[PDB]
Design a binder for these strands. Structure first.
Ligand code: MG
Ligand code: MG
Ligand code: MG
Ligand code: MG
Lengths: 72, 199, 193, 114
RNA sequence: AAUG
RNA sequence: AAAUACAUAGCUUAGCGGCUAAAGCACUGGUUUCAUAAGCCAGCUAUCAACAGUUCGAGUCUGUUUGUAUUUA
RNA sequence: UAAUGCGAUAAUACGCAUGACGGUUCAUUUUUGCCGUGUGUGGUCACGGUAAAACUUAAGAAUCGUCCA
RNA sequence: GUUUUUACUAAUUAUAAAAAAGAAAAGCUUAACUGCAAUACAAACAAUUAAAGCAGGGGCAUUGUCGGCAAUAAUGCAUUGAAGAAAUA
């Protein structure tokens, strides 16, 4: 029936930015998540420039990736 | 066990189906202004221009100007006083949002109307109007002496007594008196300013 | 006072995001726009190690405690399935609104969801039956299968070991499903489509 | 289980709106004739009074609710009214109304529900 | 410990 | 048309409110035998005439539609 | 009943704002049918009722939509 | 039985009861009393039904309500027998 006290903790992102987030306990050392929004591939904007569009349109086949293991 | 719902599709009116067979003529800005001024009671003034299409910046100024004339010329009961309060509160708020679209004459009338009305002044309506007209070029190019006379009288009543603005108005007011245009307002403003200089 | 008493998302929604949605989707009235009403967190017996539809409340205390840590507000037992059964429940639940709702969403999106293996996007919204008030509401449902990603269950690892998964529902009020997606995108939650 | 109606000469009525709370005291001679209002005090009057001296936030505030009760007490005392019966309705359960009623009882006016 |  | 009982794996036969199940034959696989029977070991049949109700929950309790006896006209 | 009403932080200081068009929900008893009682060779009879059931044209009110012809 | 609170307004064999009312939740309680009762509903009679009010001792409120249960069914004369108490002889 009694809510717990909420404290603040510092979380460091992959880009070096810091955020204060609620936490039941107190941690002196900043917490480093393994993956964040910026590092994860799903959270990526789909706005592309003309240069990127031109690169996608003009592509030539390259099979070197498959034949590398035989050469080595 | 949880049912789901399908929103019925919207009903777009078919084309070439008149909305009404009655005769409702189109109204321009000039006609709306004439309608607003030709009002005799607060109720008629309130209903003279309603809706976002007609209740524009020019309509809000006209309502305040006409309200001042009716307040001075007539005595009202409780119900009419409530109507007057509603008119003032709505008109000022509209002006505070479309002020940048007002013309020189509308701003001059707005200052005069606000000075006469006894209700509390809105946030900074007078100051904002002064800032737009502070370029000193609009008053000089104000062909209609009515706008200049209203502005001069309004500031005198409000007791602004701006040194720069008044210095410009003095020669204009004297010229208007010589030309016999807006003598009553020009004389009133000059007399008030002269009294301030004496005091 | 060295305490977390503000809300970052609350400021973002009203002072940043709201105007952008208005420009994208003009509406006659100001209040006519996407709004997030509440978020409900539920833990049922099927999401726990216990294998039984109906269990005693003393066996669900641990899960109720877990929700309190995650949300910061006490949770409540689900109502009994019938009057005959009184001392047995079927799960725990908690509902949040306002600043507490926004804080939970921020932490979930920024830290927990990106570290979940099989996440691509939240499902599409579902429209519910209008209530007596006649308001149409859409619900977006998804689940979190790894509750041991929060940094709060590390103080007593043995105590919180049985915590496995949780379900989340969000209620949105908007004029159309497209508006719901626009709000979800503004909240930085990818949608699976 | 509705109770029978009981006629009373003096009754207290409340009208709670979006913006204000109104209190009236009405005297009756019979149920078939209109009453005569002897007191008519609303938070609108209290707001105009206090605002001049002590700033208040809005008419629907604790300061105005106590002020309305005080003004009602004075009018009843001047007219030699010490006991009234409260008319119960939906508006009677409003928080603003309940605060006014509590203040009246402490001031000395005897308010009866039945 | 019935039968082929 | 009245009146008293009963519809349970492939067949006899437990059960008549706490989950939807007991026992014997039959059937399947193995063992014994030169081979077949008997004897031994392990398995299998969502195991409950049909429909509508009561109840937290009915093969189990209440009605209807079918089939079978028994007594009466 | 503008000291009104409604609101998506819903609290009320702030937001919409009393007109105008459109769509919905609510007078010669509108006058015909029908029903009831009385009387009756089963209707060339009398009176009343329908705020119990079918049936007309309005005018207004309450929401709702709307840059407004 | 009675007080307080409110994101509630159901159910019965059957039923358009009920918003200053109910249901649920929280607290205290035994009026599911002693001795009487104007006036009416109904009714062959017997019995059956509703009830203002007066005195005593109480419960919850703080001057209102309580003589069992939303209402409409859950019953049996006299005789004989038995128990508690009191008055005679
Ligand atoms: Mg043989
Ligand atoms: Mg009798
Ligand atoms: Mg008493
Ligand atoms: Mg009683």
């Amino acid at each position: 029936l009694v809510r717990p006290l909420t404290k603040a903790m510092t979380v460091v992102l992959s880009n070096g930015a810091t955020l204060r987030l609620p936490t039941v306990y107190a941690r002196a050392k900043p917490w480093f998540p393994v993956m964040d929004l910026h590092s994860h591939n799903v959270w990526k904007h789909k706005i592309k420039t003309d240069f990127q569009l031109e690169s996608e349109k003009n592509i030539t086949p390259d099979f070197s990736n498959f034949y590398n293991k035989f050469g080595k | 066990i949880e049912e789901y719902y399908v929103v019925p599709p919207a009903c777009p009116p078919p084309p070439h189906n008149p909305k009404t067979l009655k005769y409702v003529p189109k109204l321009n800005r000039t006609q709306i202004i004439a309608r607003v001024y030709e009002a005799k009671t607060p109720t008629e003034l309130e209903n003279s221009a309603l809706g976002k299409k007609f209740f524009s910046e020019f309509a809000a100024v006209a309502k305040l100007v006409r309200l001042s004339q009716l307040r001075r010329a007539n005595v009202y009961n409780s119900r009419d006083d409530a109507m007057c309060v509603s008119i003032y509160n709505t008109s000022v708020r509209v002006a505070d949002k479309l002020l940048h679209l007002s013309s020189d004459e509308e701003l001059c009338g707005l200052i005069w109307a606000l000075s006469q009305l006894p209700y509390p002044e809105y946030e900074n309506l007078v100051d904002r109007s002064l800032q737009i007209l502070l370029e000193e070029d609009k008053p000089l190019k104000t062909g209609s002496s009515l706008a200049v006379s209203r502005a001069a009288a309004g500031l005198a009543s409000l007791g602004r007594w701006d040194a720069s603005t008044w210095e410009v108005l003095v020669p204009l007011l004297r010229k208007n008196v010589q030309e016999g245009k807006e003598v009553e307002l020009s004389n009133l403003a000059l007399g008030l300013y002269d009294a301030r200089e004496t005091v | 006072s060295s305490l977390h008493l503000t809300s970052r998302y609350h400021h973002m929604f009203y002072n940043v995001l709201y105007r952008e949605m208005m420009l994208k989707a003009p509406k006659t009235k100001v209040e006519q726009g996407p709004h997030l009403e509440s978020i409900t967190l539920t833990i049922k017996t099927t999401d726990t190690r216990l294998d039984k539809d109906i269990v005693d409340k003393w066996e669900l205390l641990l899960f109720s405690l877990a929700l309190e840590h995650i949300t910061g507000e006490p949770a409540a037992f689900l109502p009994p399935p019938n009057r005959h059964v009184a001392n047995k429940s079927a799960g725990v639940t908690v509902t949040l609104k306002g600043e507490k709702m926004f804080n939970f969403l921020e932490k979930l999106v920024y830290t927990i969801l990106p570290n979940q293996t099989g996440f691509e996007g939240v499902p599409q919204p579902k429209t519910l039956v209008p209530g007596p008030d006649g308001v149409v509401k859409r619900v977006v449902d998804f689940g979190v299968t790894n509750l041991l990603l929060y940094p709060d269950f590390e103080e007593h690892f043995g105590v919180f070991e049985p915590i496995r998964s949780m379900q989340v529902r969000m209620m949105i009020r908007s004029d159309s499903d497209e508006s719901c997606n626009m709000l979800v995108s503004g909240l930085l939650v990818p949608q699976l489509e | 289980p509705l109770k029978p109606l009981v006629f009373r000469p003096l009754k207290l009525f409340f009208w709670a709106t979006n913006r204000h709370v109104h209190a009236k005291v009405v005297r009756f001679s019979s149920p078939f004739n209109e009453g005569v209002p002897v007191v008519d005090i609303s938070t609108f009057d209290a707001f105009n009074k206090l605002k001049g001296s002590a700033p208040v936030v809005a008419p629907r505030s604790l300061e105005c609710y106590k002020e309305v009760a005080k003004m009602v007490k004075e009018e009843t005392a001047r007219q030699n009214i010490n006991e009234v019966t409260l008319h119960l309705n939906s508006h009677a359960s409003d928080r603003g109304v309940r605060e006014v009623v509590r203040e009246l009882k402490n001031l000395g006016l005897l308010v009866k529900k039945v």
